[PDB]
């Protein structure tokens, strides 16, 4: 229960990006009012007060709201930051607000579906022309050769050289277990895993008319790239960045690691690729039919001269 | 599902200890018959055949028995190693056996309670004077100051120095979450965490009359030690070793790491200790009332001049 909060506060990229994204908007926040949607243990509301906000409403649905109230008190801000328990959809604020801040991004950007609550608060509580922090988000994909996966699968074929027993038949079993499922896998990668230049496949402007309906219909787009070299293709990694009106908070595997890691879409088995193998496809992020908070990703892809294939993923538990 | 098997075969201590423990008994195994209780993917049965066993019955209750049959075939041993699906309690072997091998140890030695199946097979299938591999087990305890836990709890009090927001009130919350529960926690430690000389608190001779009834009544004993230095005491670590009639397979945090890690018994909160603080107590490993395969540990302990305390733990899921 503390574990998610520990991961957040140990994430220097996340924490410093928000701290400085908020501080860069001092001019817009000075003497103004802020709503923190899903304030958690409260650090973003405190940052907003430290950037000069007159008053901050920290709205938190979970039990941890009590810790935000204590953090506010410890920092001497109890008369300017008000912690309000419950869903933002039904909280009663005493006034409309000049800015909304929220740490709404989930794995694969949209898992848990919190953006809809930020948009609900924007409509209900944000003053005309008010500020959203962050203001926008971009989605990226790249083909991957997951070096750790390669090693895990291949180790069965190395048992003979280490213990004198051939265990290579386990490779196919392990491949079925680790790649043959249809779950999105959250795992951190690096440049050593990235097989082609990353491609931006969608852009979300949080204030833009129609975004709520786009989320319901599916967010995404097509991509195309060409492989850097020869390797087993394991699938694709999806990640995001968000922008504070600019400072960019990135979750790319080519940038410093974050608690969001990346969302991995594994093909049913490895596919050999070579330098300049063309890969194209389409990725759509959707709410799951049974749970709208569980991310679903529909992947279409075409590797080289192979036929276009499809794989329909749901977020791992 | 493959994950437990990957962890096993990547555990060089486990795999080499069994390989050499088996090979050291070549004289007793040459031309003889072996039962492998819970053969899994089969490597121990193959090792026994490579030590000269005439015939090996590899008994495996789970679905993975099919992989053991394929591993046996890949190594050309299908006419000497027979993979038999189902519980050893009801398998029909064609003959009594000269030796039993088994990888029966769980976390905290007895979690999952597989030893009882080895003892059932000994009674039912082992010839008089036959060999058990391993033959014996010892249980150890030491007081611990878990350096990673210390850092995790203390990081809340460092937030002010890194981001300018006091979050020290989260320390008590985090302590309640991470130490205030009554679950056994499986985690690997090292010498940096060990606060006093480890103490052996029980010895199990697998062939000895009465062991089945001891397991039901509880295995364990008293211990006493004196702390090396000043540190927050977080509780105790429990681990085991097993002996092949001698080669010792150790899961101590002072020895190379294994997939069994150690079983950690955290006190409800840290207790300061100093050089030469005397600690005494008693540890009993028991089957859980509701699930006999789930390990329960009853801990009595006395730190310095503090009163004796009790904590009743059950294995984490
Ligand atoms: C998104 O997926 C990752 N994710 C993120 C968080 C981060 N936290 C805290 C945010 C942060 N600013 C701090 O603690 O500093 C977001 C918090 O937002 C809360 N929340 C969600 N929808 C709400 C609503 N309609 N009204 C009010 N509160 C709502 C939710 O209960 C979390 O406590 C978490 N805890 N778990 C997660 O898996
Ligand atoms: C103990 O706690 C850790 N532990 C261990 C294993 C190791 N394996 C495989 C052993 C090994 N020699 C190989 O695969 O090389 C032990 C195997 O033993 C099987 N088993 C248990 N009781 C049985 C019975 N009465 N009759 C027949 N088979 C039985 C069980 O289904 C496992 O597959 C595992 N898989 N999970 C775990 O959590």
Q: Which whole-number Å values give the CA distances from B199 to B138, B222, B238, B271, in the listed order?
A: 10, 9, 10, 20
In a 3-state reduction of DSSP, which class is residue A147? Answer: helix
Q: What is the resolution of this structure in A?
A: 1.7
- Report the gap between the CA of A73 and the closest CA in chain B (Å): 10
Experimental method: X-ray
- CA–CA distance, B108 with B12 (Å, rounded to integer): 19
Chain B: residue whose CA lies nearest to A51: B164
How do the domains of chain B map onto residue ranges?
Answer: 1-134, 136-317
* Active-site residue (options: B70, B112, B150, B212): B112
d(CA A179, CA A265): 9
Contact of A236 with A243, CB cutoff 8 Å: no
Nearby residues of B102 by Cβ (< 8 Å), 6 or more positions away = B36, B37, B38, B44, B114, B117, B118, B133
In angstroms, how far is CA B124 from the centroid of its own chain? 25
Q: After which residues is chain B broken (C to N over 2.5 A)?
A: 245
- Give the H or E element holding residue A246: none
Q: What are phi and psi of B105, to 5 degrees?
A: -70, 135
d(CA B78, CA B76): 6
Beta A183-187 vs A262-273: how paired, if at all?
antiparallel
Packing angle of the helix pair A170-179, A147-154 (nearest 10 deg): 150
Q: At what angle do helices B170-179 and A65-74 cross, to 10 degrees?
A: 140
Q: Measured at the alpha carbon of residue A5, what is the angle toward residues A9 and A83, in degrees to the nearest 5?
A: 100
Across the interface, of A5, A67, A75, the residue whose CB is closest to B165 is A75
Q: Please check whether residue B152 is in contact with residue B170, taking contact to mean a CB–CB distance below 8 angstroms.
A: no
DSSP-assigned letters across all residues of A68-125 = HHHHHHHTT-TTTEEEEES-TTT---SS-EEEEEE---BTTBTTT-THHHHHHHHHHH
A9 touches chain B (CB under 8 A): yes
CB–CB of A204/A105 below 8 Å?
no
List CB contacts of A247: < 8 A, sequence separation 6 or more: A17, A20, A21, A24
Look-up: residue for tokens 């990673």?
A: B148
Active-site residue among A6, A78, A92, A112? A112
- Taking the CB of residue A187, how many other CB atoms lie within 10 A of it? 18
Nearest to A312 by CA among A295, A302, A304: A295
- CB pair distance less than 8 Å for B174 and A6: yes
DSSP secondary structure of chain B:
--HHHHHHHT-HHHHHHHHHHHHTTHHHHTT-EEEEET-TTSHHHHHHHHTT-SEEEEEE-STTHHHHHHHHHHTT-TTTEEEEES-TTT---SS-EEEEEE---BTTBTTT-THHHHHHHHHHHEEEEEEEES-EEEEEEEEE--HHHHHHHHGGGGHHHHHS---TTHHHHHHHHHHSS-EEEEE---GGGB-S--EEEEEEETTSTTHHHHHHH-EEEEEEEE-SS-EEEEEEEEEEEEEE--EEEE--TTS---TT-EEEEEEEEEEEE-TT-EEEEEEEEEE-SS-TTSEEEEEEEEETTSPPEEEEEEE--
- Residues A57, A97 contacting (CB under 8 angstroms): yes
Task: With CB atoms and an 8 Å threshold, state whether B70 touches A169.
Answer: yes
Cα three-residue angle A67-B171-B155, rounded to 5 degrees: 115
How far apart, in whole angstroms, are the C-alpha atoms of residue B3 and residue B11? 12
Q: Which residues have a Cβ under 8 Å from the Cβ of B135 and sit 6 or more positions away?
A: B205, B206, B207, B243, B244, B245
What CA–CA distance (Å, rounded) separates A13 from A35?
A: 22
The CA-based angle B13-B16-B19, given to 5 degrees, is 145
DSSP H or E stretch at residue A56: strand A55-60
Write down the residue that tokens 């969302």 correspond to. A263
Coil/strand/helix, residue A207: coil
Class of domain B1-134: alpha beta
- How many angstroms separate the CA atoms of A274 and B100, rounded? 50
DSSP classification of residue A158? G
Q: What b-and-e string marks burial along B247-273, b requiring 16 or more CB atoms within 10 Å of the CB? A: bebbbbbeeebbbbbbbbbbbeebbeb
Residue B16 CB: number of other CB atoms within 10 A? 14
Residue B9 dihedral angles phi and psi, to the nearest 5°: -70, -25
Contact B109, B137 (CB under 8 A): yes
d(CA A159, CA A59): 54
Alpha-carbon gap, residue A233 to A230, rounded angstroms: 9
Ligand 1 center to A64 CA (angstroms): 10
CB atoms within 10 A of CB B245: 14
Domain spanning A136-317: CATH 3.40.50.12780 = no
Write phi, then psi, for A104 (nearest 5 degrees): -95, -15
Cα–ligand 1 centroid distance for A37 (angstroms): 8
d(CA B59, CA B35): 7
Among the listed residues A247, A310, A242, the one whose alpha carbon sits nearest the alpha carbon of residue A22: A247
Task: Determine whether the interchain pair A67/B43 forms a contact, defined as Cβ–Cβ distance below 8 Å.
Answer: no
Closest CA to B283 of B224, B229, B204: B224
Long-range contacts of B159-165 (CB under 8 A, 24+ apart): B159/A9, B159/A43, B163/A15, B163/A16, B163/A19, B163/A43, B164/A50, B165/A43, B165/A46, B165/A47, B165/A50, B165/A71, B165/A75
Q: Which residues of A touch B3 (CB under 8 A)?
A: 177
């Amino acid at each position: 229960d503390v574990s998610v909060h520990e991961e957040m506060i140990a994430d220097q990229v996340r924490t410093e990006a928000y701290r400085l994204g908020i501080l860069k908007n001092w001019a817009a926040l000075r003497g103004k009012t802020v709503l923190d949607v899903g304030a958690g243990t409260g650090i973003l509301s405190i940052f907003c007060a430290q950037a000069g906000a007159r008053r901050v409403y920290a709205v938190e649905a979970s039990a941890i709201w009590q810790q935000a109230r204590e953090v506010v008190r410890l920092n001497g801000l109890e008369d300017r930051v008000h912690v309000l328990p419950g869903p933002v959809e039904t909280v009663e604020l005493p006034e409309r607000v000049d800015a909304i801040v929220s740490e709404w991004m989930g794995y694969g950007l949209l898992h848990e579906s919190m953006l809809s609550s930020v948009l609900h608060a924007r409509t209900k509580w944000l003053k005309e022309g008010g500020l959203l922090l962050p203001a926008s988000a971009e989605l990226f994909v790249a083909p991957i050769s997951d070096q750790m996966l390669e090693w895990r699968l291949g180790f069965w074929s190395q048992v003979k050289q280490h213990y004198g027993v051939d265990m290579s038949c386990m490779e196919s079993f392990a491949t079925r277990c680790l790649m043959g499922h249809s779950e999105i896998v959250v795992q951190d990668l690096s440049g050593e895993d990235v097989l082609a230049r990353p491609q931006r496949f969608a852009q979300l402007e949080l204030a833009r008319a129609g975004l709520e309906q786009e989320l319901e219909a599916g967010v995404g787009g097509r991509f195309r790239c060409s492989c850097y070299g020869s390797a087993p293709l394991h699938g694709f990694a999806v990640w995001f960045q968000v922008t504070f009106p600019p400072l960019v908070l990135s979750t790319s595997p080519l940038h410093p690691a974050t608690h969001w890691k990346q969302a991995l879409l594994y093909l049913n088995e490895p596919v050999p690729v070579e330098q300049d193998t063309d890969i194209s496809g389409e990725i759509t992020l959707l709410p799951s039919p049974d749970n709208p908070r569980r991310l679903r990703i529909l992947l279409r892809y075409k590797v080289g001269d192979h036929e276009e294939k499809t794989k329909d993923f749901a977020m791992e538990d």
